[model samples]
Target: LETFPLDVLVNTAAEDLPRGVDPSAKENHLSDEDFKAVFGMTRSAFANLPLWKQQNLKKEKGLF
Candidate 1:
């Protein structure tokens, strides 16, 4: 066990999100434009992906 890799576990635990569900849903403060931008056609696209693809999509890093 002393020779086992430590970086892999460190990275995995760090990436595990601890945040709660979006607060906007509770506040009801988001504008319609916000809705259109995030949801648009992405809804159907995301739903069509298989479970594994969906998981990978969530892990994708921001390109910009």
Candidate 2:
């Protein structure tokens, strides 16, 4: 995986996910459209993953 700064992703997520949403707060909730727009995933593909598996996915923390 490419390692980018958390700040860049945090900023992008803040702008993309939802307003006033903090990545550290409750997990960002995205609609199928939102998910596809950001991560290029189809609704079916997104729904295929279990919620727990989704929870397992996380942003990288700290520096390289």
Candidate 3:
């Protein structure tokens, strides 16, 4: 119905959906054992990811 494509528009509302537990404001509170249990990967192995990808997991996707 619009002249431009709907798919090209960014959905800003959904991006702000998770209004809890801001990653940058908070620190990782997991204990050493908890961290290992959660990821099941060594710190060295996890760190091997590219810095951008690591941040995307930790911040954007909340993987960490």
Candidate 4:
């Protein structure tokens, strides 16, 4: 079995998957290009997004 510990992987599966709210909000509705851009692309006013606003805002909240 390539010296693998399958039990450890099973335990990892038992661990948590998503943190905070993930794909649970129904009010949020946007487009593919917009979403993809915010994720890792460019915007109209912003030529290019340096960092993800979502994560940066979350970090801001955590530090603030």
For residues 1-64, what per-residue lDDT tens digits would candidate 4 score against the true structure? 1121222222233235223222222012224443343334333323233335444532432310
Candidate 2 Cα RMSD (Å): 9.0
Best-to-worst ranking by TM-score? 3, 1, 2, 4
Cα lDDT tens digits for candidate 2, 1-64? 1223334544564447444444542223443344455545665664577765444543332111
Lowest lDDT block of 10, candidate 1: 1-10
Which pairs in model 3 have colliding backbones?
none
lDDT of 3 by residue, 1-49 (tens): 1121122121224455234433332213334464466446776676687
Weakest ten-residue segment in model 2 by summed lDDT: 55-64
lDDT of 1 by residue, 1-64 (tens): 0111222222334335223323212111223443234335444464587856544543432100
Error of 3 at 45 (Å): 0.3
* Worst ten in a row by lDDT for model 4: 21-30
Could you say which candidate leads in TM-score? 3
Candidate 1 Cα errors over 4 Å, as ranges? 1-41, 62-64
Number of clashes recorded per candidate: 0, 0, 0, 0
By summed lDDT, the worst window of 10 consecutive residues in model 3 runs over: 1-10
Per-residue lDDT, model 1, residue 51, is 55
